[PDB]
């Protein structure tokens, strides 16, 4: 009672939110939000310290970040460093943390029973941390792994490069991540004891007055109140003033500047940026959001629509962008066609024409009202969140908003402020602009290099004559304000649960044309529904050409519908449409109210679609580059790709796809579409706020619309063929090797094929994966430091399964091979030793994870959709498999390992894909390994092997 400075009033929440909330401020300055949820499976807490990278000392880049790794390694009360991770591990929890420019955010979840035990261990790091010196070298090699990861990633490159072109004296120029150089090599050379500087930064910065704590649990508001007072009232208050960065990092000499940048992927982008004051304080009227909505609009009369008609760009992003406390940015970013790259000046002229139009028209209240209405709807009917993300998010926002507004924060707009809009719009002018062009056409034409990532670039002043041209922009008649959004939902009725409602989806239609699975939502009760459709056609993947045409068809369909569908997206109604190895996939999600109207427009357009030649050529070129850009993908990404190609009956390569792409002409595509839609089978899942009858009426409308416009007829059952997995021979080991030409890291996937999926085989494999899961990370990543990516787990495809390992390392593939096999023996011993008690803990951990309950509709739909697309239809799977899992013995697992997985197992089926680093040449004891058969030709490999059956569906 005396340890609490004040209690907040009522925490404004949605009427639909049954969780209970209480805000308060501790006497030591800590802001608190408590969340009482008696139904939650997992409890969670989070602490956000309003200090991060921008506050690093200039001579030690990455220190805030480093302190984040170092802070959770042993305290006075809990000496052992593994304690926090261990306790969470033992009680179905997890933890994680992040460091930004102004924040360091620590969070965990745990089983609802063990909140106090977890929060106790958590609270100590903010009372008496030890920072065990033993780990220092490991945590530095960790931070170094992260940076090295991002080095070849174009987005991180652009992020840091922008920083390098501003005022070098401004904290905004800092390198926030750090690496081995900034945390070991340089501070050694300069005679810096990192540890005492770490400790110093902590002492100066980790003040309760800059801390926010969030706790979500089953316990009451009063019990949580007591617990948080008990644990956090002792955090020391050092009255640290909150860092402000009110000088803008781009000053007059950083303006009217042009940057020409070389990317890693063949991408072509234009970035237009305007320095603006910090708008955070105007949050109740949010004038940048207003301008972002309009400048970034995609409906008719939009900036984008005109840039698209002109053939200059495909996509556009607009609006306000965070900086830090004191400074912000307004951006207009576009991608560029080949013609766009030659008309950058004209593109920018058009941007200023639209900006000028918003001036001449002045502010519109009806637009603001629309935004207000949509945000109110969005807040009211917001999906429930996983507790871990929820607490972490709130902890951050506690630093920006009054207690009572912490949930409504990002949602609610109140007052229309025309003056403010006009103020922001006044900064959007040629004299305040910064321009960046990203293009490979600048390769070898650049004089500068960014130190952290190696990025190559050029800088030049924009000529005055250009600025003046932009300043003098006429009004353009192609630009118009949007009209009223007719997709705004108004019917939020939750339909009564039907008498014959089912717990799982039921087959409510089974015809030549369609299989329809349906479940009325009996859990979330929001006015939404998810409508998923799989369209099956043999002509979508028959050869590389057809697969190309499938892709382009749907890309052009989406491009054509975009103006119309954008309004619906703004109104919380969205769709996904993509091609598959079997046909097409369509998903429509969100508010059910106008859902049938959007669906019908899509099905109609699919069938009566008229192609724009100009768009066809542009989209085709963009797709070519997309196929090429896979070369720039990560090595482990490549490894996984190669293995799918290897193990699946039919699969066209990126090389085959691009080779066929030149044969896609407009007349060939126009012929393809009616052919594709001539014969179909549809399998659908309709899940949400809908009745059995409504479901049937939706399916009927989809069928009738295709039948009418495309003359669709059903496929033959014998035509509904799924692809099989390659059956590897007993005691075989095959290796496929390739090189990544971009990254100087290796990638590898090792796949131990087991058998066809079945209740028993599934649980043998999953328990084994459960057992080795933590050890694999601890040994291969933590101890041996093999690389950033270390993964093990079950692999499932085409009714078949096995065990896999994926690793990205500096070390050569064959080396990684011996270490994995070495690890596999370690676990062999380890299972023999392990106590019956420790074994049963593994079973319990697996069970809990498997029975994890979806917290939103989509997460429930996805589980159902999984069963539908695998054609196993096992909706009660979890319960059944857990029940079985519980009957398994330690022997069972030993037997299984010995028959299928052990180096000398009689039924070992091993396939490895090795992807070599850009430069690369073509401890527990590791066992002796046989000579692998090396795959030269994927077709030959496949021809020489049998193909598995397909799994019998659960009926």
Ligand X SMILES: CC(C)(C)OC(=O)NC[C@@H](Cc1cnc2ccccc2c1)c1cc(F)ccc1F
Q: In whole angstroms, how close is the CB of 752 to ligand X at the nearest point?
A: 38
Told to check if 313 binds ligand X by CB under 6 A, we report no
User: Looking at beta carbons only, is 351 or 526 nearer to ligand X?
Assistant: 351
User: Looking at beta carbons only, is 321 or 739 nearer to ligand X?
Assistant: 321
Q: In whole angstroms, how close is the CB of 331 to ligand X at the nearest point?
A: 5
Told to check if 54 binds ligand X by CB under 6 A, we report no
User: Looking at beta carbons only, is 458 or 709 nearer to ligand X?
Assistant: 458
- DSSP code, position 237: -
User: Looking at beta carbons only, is 26 or 316 nearer to ligand X?
Assistant: 316
Q: Strand 94-99 to strand 104-111: parallel, antiparallel, or no bridges (unpaired)? A: antiparallel
**Alpha-carbon distance 770 to 846, whole Å?**
7
Told to check if 174 binds ligand X by CB under 6 A, we report no
Cβ atoms of residues 228 and 216 within 8 Å: no
**Alpha-carbon distance 466 to 449, whole Å?**
27
Q: In whole angstroms, how close is the CB of 98 to ligand X at the nearest point?
A: 14
For 858, the token pair is: 């989509």
Query: Which of 105-113, 157-165, 619-627, 729-737 is the region at the interface with ligand X (rule: CB under 6 A)?
Result: 157-165
Q: Which of 30, 70, 115, 161 binds ligand X (CB under 6 A)?
A: 161
**Alpha-carbon distance 624 to 268, whole Å?**
13
- Contact positions with ligand X (CB under 6 A) in 436-495: 436
Told to check if 273 binds ligand X by CB under 6 A, we report yes
| SS3 track for 404-440 | HHCCCCCCCCCCCCHHHHHHHHHHCCHHHCEEEEECH
Cβ atoms of residues 612 and 557 within 8 Å: no
- Contact positions with ligand X (CB under 6 A) in 628-667: none
Q: Which of 37, 102, 109, 162 binds ligand X (CB under 6 A)?
A: 162
CA distances from 640 to 333, 644, 735, 749, 804 (A): 32, 6, 13, 6, 10
User: Looking at beta carbons only, is 271 or 411 nearer to ligand X?
Assistant: 271
User: Looking at beta carbons only, is 158 or 611 nearer to ligand X?
Assistant: 158
Q: In whole angstroms, how close is the CB of 155 to ligand X at the nearest point?
A: 4
Told to check if 159 binds ligand X by CB under 6 A, we report yes
User: Looking at beta carbons only, is 447 or 837 nearer to ligand X?
Assistant: 447
Where does 506-625 show beta strands of DSSP type E?
A: 506-510, 514-520, 528-536, 573-579, 583-591
**Alpha-carbon distance 335 to 154, whole Å?**
14
For 568, the token pair is: 């619906």
Q: How many residues bind ligand X (CB under 6 A)?
A: 14
Q: Which of 1, 58, 134, 155 binds ligand X (CB under 6 A)?
A: 155
3-class SS at 131? coil
User: Looking at beta carbons only, is 332 or 831 nearer to ligand X?
Assistant: 332
Q: Which helix (H) or strand (E) holds 565?
A: helix 544-570
Express the helix, strand and coil content of the chain in percent, nearest 5 each: 45, 20, 35
Query: Which of 158-166, 299-307, 752-760, 801-809 is the region at the interface with ligand X (rule: CB under 6 A)?
Result: 158-166
User: Looking at beta carbons only, is 323 or 527 nearer to ligand X?
Assistant: 323
CA distances from 278 to 104, 274, 323, 330 (A): 21, 12, 8, 11
Told to check if 330 binds ligand X by CB under 6 A, we report no
**Alpha-carbon distance 256 to 462, whole Å?**
5
User: Looking at beta carbons only, is 451 or 919 nearer to ligand X?
Assistant: 451
Told to check if 360 binds ligand X by CB under 6 A, we report no
- Contact positions with ligand X (CB under 6 A) in 231-260: 259
Q: In whole angstroms, how close is the CB of 462 to ligand X at the nearest point?
A: 12
Query: Which of 15-23, 155-163, 286-294, 902-910 is the region at the interface with ligand X (rule: CB under 6 A)?
Result: 155-163
Cβ atoms of residues 377 and 33 within 8 Å: no
Q: Which of 434, 636, 679, 811 binds ligand X (CB under 6 A)?
A: 434
Cβ atoms of residues 4 and 222 within 8 Å: no
Cβ atoms of residues 104 and 50 within 8 Å: no
Told to check if 271 binds ligand X by CB under 6 A, we report yes
Q: Which of 158, 313, 619, 646 binds ligand X (CB under 6 A)?
A: 158
Q: In whole angstroms, how close is the CB of 568 to ligand X at the nearest point?
A: 24
- Computed over its alpha carbons, how large is the radius of gyration of the chain? 29
Q: In whole angstroms, how close is the CB of 158 to ligand X at the nearest point?
A: 3
For 726, the token pair is: 């390659």
Residue nearest to ligand X (CB): 158
Q: Which of 763, 753, 773 is nearest to 877 (CA)?
A: 763
Query: Which of 153-161, 410-418, 545-553, 754-762 is the region at the interface with ligand X (rule: CB under 6 A)?
Result: 153-161
Cβ atoms of residues 99 and 50 within 8 Å: no
Told to check if 316 binds ligand X by CB under 6 A, we report no
**Alpha-carbon distance 556 to 663, whole Å?**
17
**Alpha-carbon distance 647 to 798, whole Å?**
10
The number of angstroms, rounded, from the C-alpha of 696 to the middle of its chain's C-alpha atoms is 34
User: Looking at beta carbons only, is 162 or 370 nearer to ligand X?
Assistant: 162
Q: Which of 229, 279, 331, 462 binds ligand X (CB under 6 A)?
A: 331
- Contact positions with ligand X (CB under 6 A) in 490-519: none
User: Looking at beta carbons only, is 161 or 824 nearer to ligand X?
Assistant: 161
Q: Which of 454, 439, 396, 445 is nearest to 156 (CA)?
A: 454
User: Looking at beta carbons only, is 331 or 676 nearer to ligand X?
Assistant: 331
User: Looking at beta carbons only, is 259 or 672 nearer to ligand X?
Assistant: 259
User: Looking at beta carbons only, is 165 or 456 nearer to ligand X?
Assistant: 165
Region for 769 from its dihedrals, namely left if φ exceeds 0, alpha if ψ lies in -120 to 50, beta otherwise: alpha
Q: In whole angstroms, how close is the CB of 797 to ligand X at the nearest point?
A: 33
Q: Strand 257-261 to strand 434-438: parallel, antiparallel, or no bridges (unpaired)? A: parallel
Told to check if 550 binds ligand X by CB under 6 A, we report no
Query: Which of 109-117, 156-164, 540-548, 764-772 is the region at the interface with ligand X (rule: CB under 6 A)?
Result: 156-164
Query: Which of 87-95, 152-160, 225-233, 798-806 is the region at the interface with ligand X (rule: CB under 6 A)?
Result: 152-160
Query: Which of 154-162, 240-248, 410-418, 474-482 is the region at the interface with ligand X (rule: CB under 6 A)?
Result: 154-162
Q: In whole angstroms, how close is the CB of 156 to ligand X at the nearest point?
A: 7
Q: Which of 521, 473, 434 is nearest to 158 (CA)?
A: 434
| 476 contact partners, CB below 8 Å, separation of at least 6 | 306, 350, 353, 354, 357
Cβ atoms of residues 573 and 566 within 8 Å: no
Query: Which of 139-147, 159-167, 279-287, 547-555 is the region at the interface with ligand X (rule: CB under 6 A)?
Result: 159-167
- The DSSP bridge partners found for residue 751 are 804, 911
Q: How far apart are the first and last CA of the chain?
A: 60
Q: Which of 40, 145, 333, 745 binds ligand X (CB under 6 A)?
A: 333
Q: In whole angstroms, how close is the CB of 270 to ligand X at the nearest point?
A: 9
Q: In whole angstroms, how close is the CB of 295 to ligand X at the nearest point?
A: 13
| Widest Cα–Cα separation across the chain | 82
Query: Which of 151-159, 224-232, 303-311, 562-570 is the region at the interface with ligand X (rule: CB under 6 A)?
Result: 151-159
| 235 contact partners, CB below 8 Å, separation of at least 6 | 28, 30, 126, 127, 208, 211
User: Looking at beta carbons only, is 333 or 520 nearer to ligand X?
Assistant: 333
- Contact positions with ligand X (CB under 6 A) in 559-588: none
**Alpha-carbon distance 236 to 421, whole Å?**
42
Told to check if 923 binds ligand X by CB under 6 A, we report no
User: Looking at beta carbons only, is 273 or 740 nearer to ligand X?
Assistant: 273
**Alpha-carbon distance 432 to 428, whole Å?**
7
Please count the other Cβ atoms lying within 10 Å of the Cβ belonging to residue 165. 19
Question: In the complex, which residues of this chain contact ligand X (CB under 6 A)?
Answer: 155, 158-159, 161-162, 165, 259, 271, 273, 321, 331, 333, 434, 436
């Amino acid at each position: 009672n005396p340890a609490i400075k004040r209690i907040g009033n009522h925490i404004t929440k949605s009427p639909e939110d049954k969780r209970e909330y209480r805000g308060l401020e501790l006497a030591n300055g800590i802001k608190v939000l408590l969340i009482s949820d008696p139904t939650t499976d997992k409890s969670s807490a989070a602490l956000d310290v309003h200090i991060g990278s921008l506050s690093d000392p200039p001579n030690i880049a990455g220190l805030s970040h480093f302190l984040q790794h170092m802070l959770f390694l042993g305290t006075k009360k809990y000496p052992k460093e593994n304690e926090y991770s261990q306790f969470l591990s033992e009680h179905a929890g997890s933890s994680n943390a992040f460091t930004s420019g102004e924040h360091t955010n620590y969070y965990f979840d745990v089983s609802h029973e063990h909140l106090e035990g977890a929060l106790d261990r958590f609270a100590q790091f903010f009372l008496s941390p030890l920072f065990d010196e033993s780990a220092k070298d490991r945590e530095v090699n960790a931070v170094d792994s992260e940076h090295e990861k991002n080095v070849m990633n174009d987005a991180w490159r652009l992020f840091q490069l922008e920083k390098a072109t501003g005022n070098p004296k401004h904290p905004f120029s800092k390198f926030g991540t750090g690496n081995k150089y900034t945390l070991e090599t340089r501070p050694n050379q300069e005679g810096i004891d990192v540890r005492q500087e770490l400790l110093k930064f902590h002492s100066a910065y980790y003040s309760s007055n800059l801390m926010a704590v969030v706790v979500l649990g089953r316990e009451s508001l009063d019990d949580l109140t007591n617990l948080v007072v008990k644990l956090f009232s002792e955090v020391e208050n050092k009255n640290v003033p909150l860092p402000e960065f009110p000088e803008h990092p781009f000053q007059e000499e950083h303006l009217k500047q042009l940057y020409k940048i070389v990317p890693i992927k063949d991408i072509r982008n234009l970035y237009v940026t305007f320095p603006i004051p910090d708008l955070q304080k105007y949050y109740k009227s949010n004038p940048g959001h207003y301008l972002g909505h309009l400048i970034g609009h995609e409906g008719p009369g939009s900036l984008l629509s005109e840039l698209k008609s002109k053939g200059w760009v495909n996509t556009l992003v607009g609006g306000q962008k965070e900086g830090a406390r004191g400074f912000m940015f307004f951006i207009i970013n576009v991608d560029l066609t080949e013609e766009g790259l030659l008309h950058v000046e004209d593109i920018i002229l058009h941007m200023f024409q639209y900006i000028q139009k918003l001036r001449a028209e002045g502010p519109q209240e009806w637009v603001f009202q629309e935004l207000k209405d949509l945000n109110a709807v969005a807040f009211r009917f917001k999906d429930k969140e996983r507790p871990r993300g929820y607490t972490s998010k709130i902890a951050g926002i506690l630093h920006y908003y009054p207690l009572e507004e912490v949930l409504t924060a990002e949602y609610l707009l109140e007052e229309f402020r025309p003056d403010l809009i006009e103020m922001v719009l006044d900064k959007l002018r040629p004299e305040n602009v910064r321009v960046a062009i990203v293009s490979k056409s600048f390769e070898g034409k650049t004089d500068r290099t960014e130190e952290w990532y190696g990025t190559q670039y050029k800088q030049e002043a924009i000529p005055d004559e250009v600025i003046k041209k932009w300043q003098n922009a006429d009004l353009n008649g192609k630009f118009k304000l949007p009209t009223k959004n007719e997709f705004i939902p108004t019917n939020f009725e939750i339909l009564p649960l039907e008498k014959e409602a089912t717990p799982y989806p039921a087959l409510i239609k089974d015809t030549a044309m369609s299989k329809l699975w349906f479940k009325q939502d009996d859990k979330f009760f929001l006015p939404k529904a998810n409508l998923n459709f799989e369209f099956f056609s043999p002509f979508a993947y028959v050869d590389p050409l057809h697969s190309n045409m499938a892709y382009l068809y749907l890309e052009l369909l989406k491009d054509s519908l975009n103006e119309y569908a954008y309004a619906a997206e703004l109104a919380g109604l969205s769709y996904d449409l993509q091609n598959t190895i079997y046909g097409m996939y369509l998903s429509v999600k969100g508010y059910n109210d106008k859902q049938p109207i959007l669906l019908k427009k899509i099905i109609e357009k699919m069938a009566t679609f008229e192609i724009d030649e100009k768009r066809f050529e542009i989209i085709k070129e963009a797709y070519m580059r997309s196929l090429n850009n896979f070369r720039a993908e990560q090595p482990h990404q490549h490894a996984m790709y190669y293995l799918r190609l290897l193990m699946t009956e039919v699969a066209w390569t990126k090389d085959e796809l691009k080779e066929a792409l030149d044969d896609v002409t407009l007349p060939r595509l126009k012929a393809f579409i009616p052919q594709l839609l001539s014969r179909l089978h549809i399998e659908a899942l309709l899940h949400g706020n809908i009745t059995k009858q409504a479901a049937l009426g939706i399916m009927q409308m989809v069928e009738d619309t295709l039948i009418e416009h495309a003359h669709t007829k059903p496929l033959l059952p014998s035509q509904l063929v799924r692809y099989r997995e390659v059956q590897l021979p007993d005691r075989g080991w095959f290796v496929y090797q390739q090189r990544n030409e971009v990254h100087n890291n290796s990638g590898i996937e090792i796949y131990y094929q087991t058998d066809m999926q079945s209740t028993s085989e599934n649980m043998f494999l999953e328990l084994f994966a459960q057992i080795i899961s933590e050890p694999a990370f601890n040994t291969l990543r933590t101890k041996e430091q093999l690389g950033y990516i270390v993964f093990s787990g079950p692999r499932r495809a085409n009714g078949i399964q096995g065990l896999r390992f994926i690793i990205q390392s500096e070390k050569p593939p064959h080396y990684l091979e011996s270490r994995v096999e070495a690890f596999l023996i370690t676990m062999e011993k380890s299972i023999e030793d392990m106590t019956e008690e420790a074994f049963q803990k593994h079973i319990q951990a697996l069970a809990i994870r498997r029975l994890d309950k979806p917290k939103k509709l989509s997460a429930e739909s996805a589980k159902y959709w999984g069963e539908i697309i695998s054609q196993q239809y096992n909706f009660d799977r979890d319960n059944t498999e857990v029940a079985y899992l519980k009957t398994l013995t330690k022997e069972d697992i030993i037997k299984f390992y010995k028959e299928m997985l052990a180096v000398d197992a009689p039924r070992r089926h091993k396939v490895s894909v090795h992807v070599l680093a850009r430069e690369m040449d073509s401890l527990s004891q590791a066992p002796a390994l046989p000579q692998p058969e090396v795959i030269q030709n994927m077709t030959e490999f496949k021809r020489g092997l049998p193909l598995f059956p397909l799994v019998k569906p659960h009926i």
